[PDB]
Design a binder for this molecule. Structure first.
Ligand SMILES: Nc1ncnc2c1ncn2[C@@H]1O[C@H](COP(=O)(O)OP(=O)(O)O)[C@@H](O)[C@H]1O
Length: 283
């Protein structure tokens, strides 16, 4: 682990535990001693570019990585600014942003629970149609709020949807820094998410781009894995509609909603979140 230790201080903030560590940042449970509340802190930390120094600042692993490191940092800042536009229960709420230690930090609201990816791995028996139909209204609302302000998410999968103990979802992360680093470094494999990214993301984008990825999330919850990579589908579509697979315990109405979200071409999908939600009605 490259994480700051428990007890580390940023003025009034104290690190309590590193609770998430990926290749591009570290998430900490932390405590604000001024406001006496638990928060999360997200630290930009691209491990392929940078390492932890003895004084716990961040330094480049090689001088050739400086431009890509700074571009990732700039994208991290821009993502914090985008999230700072919203005050919505289903979108990560940005409290704090600052630069220190050669990197950058976002202080955010602390959310209970775990990611949808971890819930699906640990308690797949909890995920049934009734649970999915309770998940969708707040998840729809969160995505639609992004869309209504003129933005797209473009990185939806199970990994960046938090499921709180209340079961309410939170969108945590748009992958901006990761995706910028991948584009600049020709590490294409960290830019799009195979099976979740629709065809128009591989090089025309709009709400239907996020709707496809949400369809792919739902497909993963229902049958356990995402649909085929969209570029492979565009050559020869081996996607088997869920209405034909008929997984046990799932209604044609929900299965058809997933299939429509996963329509290969953008124009054949629901065009807005509201359109997709309307598909779940009439039953
Ligand atoms: N604002 C937040 N509040 C609470 N948890 C968060 C917040 N932002 C991110 N997380 C958590 O950070 C984790 C990031 O990656 P994860 O896969 O857990 O790494 P690790 O392999 O170290 O467990 C996720 O589990 C997610 O639940």
């Amino acid at each position: 682990s490259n994480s700051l230790p428990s007890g580390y201080r940023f003025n009034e903030f104290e690190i309590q535990e590193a609770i998430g560590e990926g290749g591009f940042g570290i998430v900490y449970r932390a405590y604000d001693h001024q406001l006496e509340r638990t928060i999360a802190i997200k630290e930009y930390m691209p491990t392929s570019l940078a390492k932890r120094n003895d004084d716990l600042s961040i330094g480049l692993r090689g001088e050739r990585f400086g431009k890509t490191f700074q571009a990732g940092l700039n994208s991290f800042i821009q993502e914090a600014r985008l999230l700072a536009r919203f005050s919505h229960p289903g979108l990560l709420h940005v409290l704090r942003f600052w630069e220190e230690n050669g990197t950058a930090y976002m202080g955010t609201q602390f959310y209970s629970g775990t990611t949808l990816k971890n819930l699906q791995a640990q308690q797949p028996e909890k995920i049934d149609e009734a649970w999915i139909r309770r998940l969708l209204p707040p998840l729809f609302s969160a995505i639609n709020t992004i869309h209504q302000e003129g933005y797209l998410h473009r990185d939806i999968s199970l990994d960046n949807i938090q499921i709180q103990e209340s079961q309410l979802p939170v969108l945590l992360d748009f992958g901006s820094a990761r995706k910028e680093i991948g584009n600049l470094s020709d590490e294409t494999e960290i830019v799009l998410k195979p099976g979740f990214a629709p065809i128009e993301q591989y090089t025309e984008q709009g709400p239907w781009t996020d709707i496809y990825a949400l369809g792919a999330v739902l497909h993963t919850l229902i049958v356990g894995s995402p649909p085929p990579v969209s570029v492979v589908r565009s050559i020869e579509d081996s996607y088997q509609p869920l209405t034909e697979r008929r997984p046990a315990g799932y209604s044609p109405e929900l299965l058809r909603t997933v299939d429509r979200a996963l329509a290969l071409k953008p124009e054949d999908r629901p065009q807005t979140i509201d359109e997709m939600a309307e598909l779940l009605e009439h039953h």
